[PDB]
Amino acid sequence: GHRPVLVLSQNTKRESGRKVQSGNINAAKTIADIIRTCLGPKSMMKMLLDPMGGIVMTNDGNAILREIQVQHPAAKSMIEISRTQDEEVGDGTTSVIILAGEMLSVAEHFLEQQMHPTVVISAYRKALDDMISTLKKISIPVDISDSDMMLNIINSSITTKAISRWSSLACNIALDAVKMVQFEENGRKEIDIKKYARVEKIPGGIIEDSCVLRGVMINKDVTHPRMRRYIKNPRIVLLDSSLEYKKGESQTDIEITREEDFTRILQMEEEYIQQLCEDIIQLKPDVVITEKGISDLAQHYLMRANITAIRRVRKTDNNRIARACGARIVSRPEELREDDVGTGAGLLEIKKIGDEYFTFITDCKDPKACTILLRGASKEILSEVERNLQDAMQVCRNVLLDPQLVPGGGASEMAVAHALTEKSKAMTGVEQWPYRAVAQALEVIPRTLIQNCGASTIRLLTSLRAKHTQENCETWGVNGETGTLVDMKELGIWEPLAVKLQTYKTAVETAVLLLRIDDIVSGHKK
């Protein structure tokens, strides 16, 4: 017997030292190599298989890394930073992974050479600050009133995605959607393209007929077929309350001894429904939309008033209908006011798409919410189109908030790397080497672009690194479609400064995080 007299629990495995460092860095650069080929306009799709029998055909770095599963904590951290980039800016989710992988890769060198991780980290932080300075120095502003300039900004963001074939179409959609979702109340500007720009994918049809509606769309039909399905100036009312007769919250137990009491009580229920419906009709609406049920007697009373009702809508759809038609959701028809009625909708239609009935509240004027109706070949194609449109809309939003632009095609990476190399000559300590290595690590973005284009990395990178030593060449980069150096002022690939700033910050900070890490431990229970 003599049970094991341990200090730590069995299954507690502890690694330490340069093995842990090299393992973390290799896991990170593996996560990078997974999506290395998914960068640029000449990328190829990846078909991932979900655990739920689903399929995801994509080029999106965050989609890919989110669909794969890992057990190494470094790979976990890289997937987490990809998620961070996607949530913050909604683009660059694979540029960040590649940059972080390359930074860790170049730090492996200095770590094998007896340098301490904190030295590498201090150098990385210097290099990040100077990247920020250089980006803010080379950026240019944008007149967001120039719809064509904005369409070019959005094209420079979707050119690397599948919808590139209908790029102009998708560009307009994203721009339109964002311009409608811009909302200000009490001095607070808000572009909330997650609650008020909705993407509805209806398989079939053709993608070229997909459109952004001046209103919203839901999958609903009239509650009663005597109700109109087409109304050309609908006054709309929104409710959070059930138009049924529900019980009270207390123990409302009744006690009947007289004969007339049962009938009187049931007629009392009918009268309650009548009184609700009259409190509603007094505002003279044409359409009534509820988040909860609508009793059939209430349907009768509303129809008598020539009102069309839709029974059980979601709270999110109700909020979008509010923003689109200009209404205010209420929960007590007794508290209903003309200011709560929805004027602004230009047409309510309920039409048959395939074998389903869809409710449009379109033709609105000044709708602060929208529905992007996507049509296409299949749920997978349309899910990919939706992700690409998310990229486009998030880019448009980042632009409207921070209108500053930086050059693409890797031009920005080379310009900033050159600036860092030039500043490194004043450095006399030992950190100049990691600092210059981070400068050489920014070069990976054009390298990956050239590799995915199918060109010669050595030659092109040499000519480009040389071009960026001249004076007015901080805009020069590479084409992801032909493998040649161009001026971005001549190509047109311009990303939002906010996107690339967040990219660089996330990359450098992820590198710092994984460098500080040592001494992995495992096993212990939650």
Partner: protein, 317 residues
């Protein structure tokens, strides 16, 4: 996949088909981050559980729960996954129409199916035929099942559950002290083959408690005798017990003996009641949702749109 929401007059015990354990036991299941990832759940945490005694009292509550057992504790969308809900035996038609209106209209589920909790309990034990004695906290039910479906005509319903059981024990009043009696009910309470030889060293009989209807063994026997004489062998020999109530005393052999006594001296009765997986109904639902006959049984969204409460009631009135 197929979401399998097992209400089971317990907790939500929701998840996916293929999982051996639910992933969304909401009732009685982060912070300092940024967003609404605790407040939205903090609201539900103190919301009363709608199902009482195996019957839904407040539907708005139940709907809010389901909605929070889809978007928060599963982070999925019901618009693409079929749902398998569970209902208590002899559940009113109105409740069925209500939940089917909720799922198809509110959650816009492509297809759904409502299964009896005893049938899914039998499924989790691996069998498709037998008579299930489900005794929980508020109700007792005998469900004869043949070919995997609860015969809707031989469901005998008597009422002697955990409450009614601990009652006489209390007799032998304050919440805490009747819960001491109930703690003894929760702990060992070995069933007596014969109360004579069990009290010597110190539900089956209504007179004991004070009722005047029938014992649970009489109930099983008559539920078996209101079925086919050929399937009688299977009902008698595949009696499966379920419910923490019936588990606490661990009643197998007293039942077996007096059921053998009641039955003709032909069929050999064997009762399988050792599982206690504490998710039997969920696993039965998962098995069903995994099968393809579940796709066969789907009440589809188109079917719902075309028929309404009639499709939920499966016609045949």
């Amino acid at each position: 996949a197929a979401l399998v929401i097992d209400n089971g007059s317990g907790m939500c015990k929701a998840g996916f088909a293929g999982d051996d354990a639910p992933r969304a036991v909401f009732p009685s299941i982060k912070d300092s981050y940024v967003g609404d990832e605790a407040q939205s759940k903090r609201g539900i945490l103190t919301l009363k559980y709608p199902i009482e005694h195996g019957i839904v009292t407040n539907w708005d509550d139940m709907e809010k729960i389901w909605h929070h057992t889809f978007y928060n504790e599963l982070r999925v969308a019901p618009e693409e996954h079929p749902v398998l809900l569970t209902e208590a035996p002899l559940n009113p038609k109105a409740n069925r129409e209500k939940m089917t209106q909720i799922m198809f209209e509110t959650f816009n589920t492509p297809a759904m199916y409502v299964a009896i909790q005893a049938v899914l309990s039998l499924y989790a034990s691996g069998r498709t035929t037998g008579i299930v004695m489900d005794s929980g906290d508020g109700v007792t039910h005998t469900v004869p099942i043949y070919e995997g479906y609860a015969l809707p005509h031989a469901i005998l319903r008597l009422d002697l559950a955990g409450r009614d059981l601990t009652d006489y024990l209390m007799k032998i009043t304050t919440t805490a002290e009747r819960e001491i009696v109930r703690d003894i009910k929760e702990k060992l309470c070995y069933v007596a083959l014969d109360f004579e030889q069990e009290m010597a060293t110190a539900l089956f009989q209504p007179s004991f408690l004070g009722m005047e209807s029938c014992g649970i063994h009489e109930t099983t026997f008559n539920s078996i005798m209101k079925c086919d004489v050929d399937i009688r062998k299977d009902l008698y020999a595949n009696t499966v017990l379920s419910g923490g109530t019936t588990m606490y005393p661990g009643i197998a052999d007293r039942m077996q003996k007096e059921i053998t006594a009641l039955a003709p001296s032909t069929m050999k009765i064997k009762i399988i009641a050792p599982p206690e997986r504490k998710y039997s109904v969920w696993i039965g639902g998962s098995i069903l949702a995994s099968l393809s006959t579940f796709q066969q049984m789907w009440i589809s969204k188109q079917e719902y749109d075309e028929s309404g409460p009639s499709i939920v009631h499966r016609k045949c009135f």
